[PDB]
Design a binder for this molecule. Structure first.
Ligand SMILES: CC(=O)N[C@@H]1[C@@H](O)[C@H](O)[C@@H](CO)O[C@@H]1O
Ligand code: NA
Length: 355
């Protein structure tokens, strides 16, 4: 938005400095995020995407519950800065806005630079699952329905494909046919949740690497951010999504596919950290599905990118017309390598489950 509008928004919130600037910030695809600079502290200002999260009240209730519980254990988290009237968010001119304190002395990554960073990510998200187990499912109502229900995502994909609103399907038949041909694989986790062979757990549901902040000195995890999708699911959604984003040798939107590979060493590092924290709760069936959960979440995210391309880019932020096609192509390349390396990942999990 204009500066006039953004500075106006900021005046609704209990900031503790005179604002000097408000500038676009970060690589989130969903909300619209800004860095607020002041004569003292920094803030993150976000316009929440109400097309994706229509029930703002329930969403903020969940975020308040999670963050207040962390605070009450003396654990660093996202610190909501209230409105000047004490509310957790503001509805202003038809938009929903919130502010968080900027988390100082941190670093974050869109791409794993070395195995230790990714091991730490695994530990952080594994620990967060232990934390979340303290809630029962009823305390944290779903903020998005069918969120990691891959068969439901596939129904959405098939509809986007049949409609082919922009005539973009002609240019991406290999990608389309990849997702169509893997239809038989999409129900495995949902079927296990439904029949009780996979435990229903409270999960984070968007565990990509850039949703953790690490300390700039110690390298240890400081805080997990992007708390909007905390809701019931499977452990496998958090593990699989982490592998999807972080076991790649390339960015999610890397144009040069020759740079995109699935790294079994990174898979190992993350699994060491994650299982390291969850060894006392992980079931045999969950352990059996750890490698395939990577395939599943990567395919789910990929099909969502491609569906969005076919629909004219209505869901994910994009920077250029082909951006979602570029994104779906990395996800496909990753799954192709995950398939080829299946025996190796199976062996890695077995080896860690004996440690
Ligand atoms: C709420 C929502 O749709 N979040 C998505 C997440 O599911 C997806 O895996 C990611 C891809 O980078 O983008 C967004 O964060
Ligand atoms: Na739906």
């Amino acid at each position: 938005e204009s500066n006039e509008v953004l500075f106006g928004i900021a005046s609704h919130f209990a900031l503790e400095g005179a604002v000097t600037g408000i500038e676009p910030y970060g690589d989130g695809h969903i909300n619209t995020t800004y860095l607020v600079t002041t004569d003292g502290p920094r803030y993150i200002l976000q316009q929440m995407n109400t097309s994706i999260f229509p029930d703002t009240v329930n969403l903020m209730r969940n975020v308040e519950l999670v963050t207040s519980t962390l605070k009450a254990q003396g654990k660093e988290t996202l610190d909501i800065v209230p409105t000047t009237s004490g509310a957790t968010w503001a509805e202003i001119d038809g938009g929903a806005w919130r502010v968080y304190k900027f988390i100082e002395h941190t670093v974050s990554y869109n791409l794993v630079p070395n195995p230790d960073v990714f091991r730490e990510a695994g530990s952080a998200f594994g620990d967060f699952q232990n934390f979340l187990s303290e809630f029962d499912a009823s305390q944290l109502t779903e903020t998005i329905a069918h969120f990691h229900d891959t068969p439901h995502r596939f129904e959405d994909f098939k509809a986007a494909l049949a409609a082919d609103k922009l005539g973009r399907a002609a240019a991406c038949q290999p990608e389309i046919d990849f997702y169509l041909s893997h239809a038989d694989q999409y129900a495995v986790v949902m079927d296990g949740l439904r029949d009780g062979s996979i435990p229903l757990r409270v999960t984070h549901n968007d565990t990509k690497l850039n949703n953790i902040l690490m300390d700039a000195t110690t390298g240890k995890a400081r805080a997990i951010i992007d708390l909007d999708t905390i809701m019931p699911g499977s452990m496998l959604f958090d593990f699989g999504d982490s592998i999807r984003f972080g076991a790649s040798t390339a960015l999610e939107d890397e144009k040069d596919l020759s740079k995109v590979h699935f790294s079994t060493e990174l898979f190992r590092a993350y699994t060491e950290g994650f299982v390291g924290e969850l060894r006392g709760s992980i079931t045999a069936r969950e352990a059996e599905l750890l490698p395939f959960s990577g395939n599943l979440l990567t395919m789910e995210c990929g099909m969502r990118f491609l569906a969005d391309y076919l629909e004219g880019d209505i869901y994910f932020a994009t920077k250029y017309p082909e951006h979602n096609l570029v994104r779906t192509r990395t996800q496909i390349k990753l799954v192709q390598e995950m398939e080829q390396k299946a025996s190796e990942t199976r062996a890695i999990v077995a080896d860690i489950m004996e440690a």
